[PDB]
Amino acid sequence: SQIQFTRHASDVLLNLNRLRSRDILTDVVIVVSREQFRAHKTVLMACSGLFYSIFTDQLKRNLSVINLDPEINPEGFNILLDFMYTSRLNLREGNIMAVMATAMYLQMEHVVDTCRKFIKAS
Amino acid sequence: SQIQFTRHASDVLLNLNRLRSRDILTDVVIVVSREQFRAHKTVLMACSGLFYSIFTDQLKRNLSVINLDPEINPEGFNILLDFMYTSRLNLREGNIMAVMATAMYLQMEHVVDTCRKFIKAS
Ligand SMILES: O=C(Cn1ccc2c(=O)[nH]c(NCc3ccccc3F)nc21)Nc1ccncc1Cl
Ligand SMILES: O=C(Cn1ccc2c(=O)[nH]c(NCc3ccccc3F)nc21)Nc1ccncc1Cl
Ligand SMILES: [Cl-]
Numbered sequence: 001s002q003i004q005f006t007r008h009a010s011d012v013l014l015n016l017n018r019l020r021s022r023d024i025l026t027d028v029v030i031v032v033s034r035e036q037f038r039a040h041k042t043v044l045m046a047c048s049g050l051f052y053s054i055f056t057d058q059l060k061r062n063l064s065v066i067n068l069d070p071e072i073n074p075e076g077f078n079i080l081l082d083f084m085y086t087s088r089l090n091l092r093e094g095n096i097m098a099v100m101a102t103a104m105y106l107q108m109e110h111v112v113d114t115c116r117k118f119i120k121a122s
Numbered sequence: 123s124q125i126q127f128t129r130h131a132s133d134v135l136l137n138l139n140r141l142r143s144r145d146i147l148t149d150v151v152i153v154v155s156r157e158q159f160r161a162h163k164t165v166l167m168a169c170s171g172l173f174y175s176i177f178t179d180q181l182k183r184n185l186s187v188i189n190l191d192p193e194i195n196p197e198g199f200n201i202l203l204d205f206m207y208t209s210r211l212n213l214r215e216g217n218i219m220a221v222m223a224t225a226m227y228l229q230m231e232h233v234v235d236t237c238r239k240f241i242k243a244s
C-alpha cells in the first residue's frame with residue numbers, strides 16, 4: 001500500500017548519468033583498446049553480468065581499472081555504456097553486429113535478445 | 123531514434139537496492155540520533171538536495187560519515203531512504219508529519235509536495 005512514484009527510477013538514472021558526465025564519484029576506468037571510459041561500479045554491476053561477476057568478488061572489488069578483451073570494439077562498448085545510463089539503445093545498421101557481440105561479452109542478455117530482433121527486422 | 127527500454131531504469135534501481143542490502147560498494151554511513159544507515163553517495167545525491175549539496179563540494183566529497191541534525195526522526199529518515207531506492211513511499215497516518223519534516227530537511231521537494239497531498243486527503 002505504498003505510494004508509487006512512476007518517474008523516480010528514471011530521474012535517478014538521469015541524475016547518475018549527470019554525475020558520470022561530471023566525473024563525480026566515478027570509481028573505475030574501463031580500458032577498451034585505445035579508449036578509456038569512466039563509470040560507477042554500482043551502475044556497471046546493475047547492468048552487466050560480466051561487471052557484476054567481477055566486482056562481487058572480494059578479490060576484484062577494489063579494482064580501479066579494468067582492461068576489456070582487446071577484440072572488443074570501443075564503439076560497441078560506448079553504445080552499451082550509454083544504454084546503461086540512459087535506457088536508450090543506439091542500434092543502427094552499421095553498428096548492430098559490434099553491439100550484439102559486445103553485449104554477449106558483457107552478459108547483457110535482454111540487450112542481446114533485442115539485437116536478435118533488429119537483425120530479423122533487417 | 124534510439125530504442126527505449128521501459129523497465130531498465132527501474133531494474134537498475136532494484137539492483138542498486140540489492141547491492142545496498144548486501145553492503146556492496148556502499149561508501150557512506152548516515153548517523154541519525156542513535157541509528158546508522160549505509161548507502162551509496164551517488165544515489166543519495168540523485169535523490170536529495172541536501173546530499174547533492176554536501177557531496178558536490180570538493181571539501182566534503184570524501185566524507186565517509188554524515189551526522190544528520192539530532193532532531194531528525196530516524197524512522198522518517200529510513201522511510202525516505204527506502205523511497206530513494208525503491209520508488210515507493212511508505213506514507214501513513216502515524217508517520218506523515220515526521221516524513222514531511224524529514225523530506226523538507228533533505229530537500230526532496232516532490233516528496234514534500236506529495237506529503238501536502240496526504241495531509242489534505244486526511
Ligand atoms: O543482475 C545483475 C546484472 N545483470 C544485468 C543484466 C544481466 C544479464 O543479462 N545477465 C547476468 N548474468 C549474471 C547474473 C547476475 C546476477 C544474477 C543472475 C545472473 F545470471 N547479469 C545481468 N546485477 C545484480 C543482480 C542481483 N543483485 C544485484 C545486482 Cl547489481
Ligand atoms: O537533483 C538532484 C537532487 N535532488 C533530487 C530531488 C531534489 C529536490 O527536490 N531539490 C533539490 N535542490 C537542490 C538542487 C540540486 C540540483 C539542481 C537544482 C537544485 F535545486 N535537489 C534534488 N541531484 C542532481 C542534480 C543534477 N545533477 C546531478 C544530480 Cl545527482
Ligand atoms: Cl569524485
Ligand SMILES: [Cl-]
Pocket residue numbers: 061145146147148
Ligand atoms: Cl564493498
